[PDB]
Amino acid sequence: RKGDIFLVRGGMRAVEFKVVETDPSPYCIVAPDTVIHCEGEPIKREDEEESLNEVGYDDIGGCRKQLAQIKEMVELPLRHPALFKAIGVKPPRGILLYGPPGTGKTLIARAVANETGAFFFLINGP
Amino acid sequence: NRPNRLIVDEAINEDNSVVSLSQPKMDELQLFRGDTVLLKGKKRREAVCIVLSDDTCSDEKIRMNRVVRNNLRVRLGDVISIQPCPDVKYGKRIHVLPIDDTVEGITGNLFEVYLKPYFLEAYRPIRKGDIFLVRGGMRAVEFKVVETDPSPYCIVAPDTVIHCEGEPIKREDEEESLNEVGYDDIGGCRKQLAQIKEMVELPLRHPALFKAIGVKPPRGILLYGPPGTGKTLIARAVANETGAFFFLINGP
Numbered sequence: 291r292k293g294d295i296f297l298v299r300g301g302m303r304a305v306e307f308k309v310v311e312t313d314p315s316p317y318c319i320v321a322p323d324t325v326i327h328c329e330g331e332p333i334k335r336e337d338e339e340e341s342l343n344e345v346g347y348d349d350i351g352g353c354r355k356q357l358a359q360i361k362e363m364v365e366l367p368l369r370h371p372a373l374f375k376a377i378g379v380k381p382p383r384g385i386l387l388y389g390p391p392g393t394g395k396t397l398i399a400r401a402v403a404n405e406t407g408a409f410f411f412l413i414n415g416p
Numbered sequence: 417n418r419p420n421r422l423i424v425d426e427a428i429n430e431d432n433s434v435v436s437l438s439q440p441k442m443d444e445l446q447l448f449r450g451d452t453v454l455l456k457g458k459k460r461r462e463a464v465c466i467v468l469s470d471d472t473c474s475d476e477k478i479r480m481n482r483v484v485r486n487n488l489r490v491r492l493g494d495v496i497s498i499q500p501c502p503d504v505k506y507g508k509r510i511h512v513l514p515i516d517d518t519v520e521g522i523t524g525n526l527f528e529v530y531l532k533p534y535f536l537e538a539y540r541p542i543r544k545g546d547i548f549l550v551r552g553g554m555r556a557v558e559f560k561v562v563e564t565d566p567s568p569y570c571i572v573a574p575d576t577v578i579h580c581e582g583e584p585i586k587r588e589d590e591e592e593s594l595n596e597v598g599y600d601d602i603g604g605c606r607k608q609l610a611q612i613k614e615m616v617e618l619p620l621r622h623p624a625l626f627k628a629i630g631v632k633p634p635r636g637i638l639l640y641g642p643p644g645t646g647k648t649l650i651a652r653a654v655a656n657e658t659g660a661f662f663f664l665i666n667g668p
């Protein structure tokens with residue numbers, strides 16, 4: 291469809307391609323009978339849009355059901371914020387992700403922040 | 417010596433606008449259960465409630481809920497005036513307004529959710545200029561009675577319309593919000609709270625006594641226990657119930 295970004299994986303890399311022009315509108319199913327117009331000139335994408343190279347649930351694997359617990363923990367406070375203003379209850383405002391180094395705790399934090407839309411701030415220890 | 421016969425005490429049963437009296441003496445008060453009873457507190461204020469009998473209540477004191485106690489402005493261990501009034505007058509279009517900073521907890525229609533389920537068959541006598549607490553929607557809202565067709569008080573019955581305002585109005589500041597902590601909010605400890613209350617009563621509840629008598633009351637108490645056991649709750653409740661000015665010196 292017009293004005294969508296689709297991700298192509300290859301060459302040990304991932305490139306997102308925008309569909310800016312198309313003969314039929316607004317969308318068309320691609321078939322092996324339509325030529326491809328060549329531009330080869332990268333164009334900056336609109337900033338409000340989120341780059342797909344950012345971390346997400348898929349990038350965080352190996353933990354399974356701890357990520358589900360964190361998602362349930364963080365959904366209402368972040369995914370439905372106005373609810374807590376009209377209801378008197380305290381959501382979880384402090385979570386200690388603990389484990390051996392390299393287990394993806396920073397991955398979990400970044401993915402939760404991005405998926406829920408929350409503004410992620412990193413307070414590095416040192 | 418013809419005492420007042422009415423004292424302030426904590427309420428054991430869950431109920432609002434209900435006052436319990438000692439079972440041993442019914443003729444003294446000359447009132448048995450299920451009758452409107454007037455009560456004079458302090459600062460020229462009075463309240464109306466319903467009286468019952470409790471075997472556990474001590475004859476010296478009269479158990480009463482925190483809402484009514486706040487209405488009278490009396491505190492635990494205080495002495496007030498009671499007056500058995502079999503007379504009671506119904507009301508017409510009893511008026512109520514939102515009070516204090518409690519707001520944003522209701523959207524659209526705001527009277528069917530809270531008032532209707534509570535005043536339906538309750539027969540709670542409402543008096544002018546009193547605040548009563550309604551529990552619902554995982555929230556607690558205190559409603560002021562500013563207007564009422566009969567004066568000064570009227571027993572609510574299922575035949576009087578309700579006037580709708582839906583506009584919260586700031587309550588007088590000297591009055592104490594019932595959302596603050598109290599003895600009821602502090603449970604699970606039982607008889608340690610009694611020890612702290614006895615410990616702190618005279619120094620705070622009767623301060624002038626120690627100036628005319630030479631003795632030292634307890635001026636240092638160490639509440640110790642596992643974290644989360646309500647020590648801060650106990651301190652705040654003791655400060656509020658005794659009227660003392662509570663100051664928090666946070667460790668960090």
Ligand SMILES: Nc1ncnc2c1ncn2[C@@H]1O[C@H](COP(=O)(O)OP(=O)(O)O)[C@@H](O)[C@H]1O
Pocket residue numbers: 349350351352353390391392393394395396397398
């Ligand atoms: N469970 C996992 N699933 C996918 N990638 C992981 C996982 N754990 C670690 N990684 C990879 O290892 C990198 C380092 O882990 P990281 O979470 O940043 O450090 P820490 O665990 O101390 O917070 C991560 O950037 C990520 O790429």
Ligand SMILES: Nc1ncnc2c1ncn2[C@@H]1O[C@H](COP(=O)(O)OP(=O)(O)O)[C@@H](O)[C@H]1O
Pocket residue numbers: 601602603604605642643644645646647648649650
């Ligand atoms: N015995 C209790 N009765 C009712 N609520 C309690 C009790 N103990 C703890 N709580 C609740 O847990 C909260 C935290 O306990 P708190 O007393 O503030 O911490 P600390 O014990 O370190 O002083 C309190 O705000 C209160 O709501």
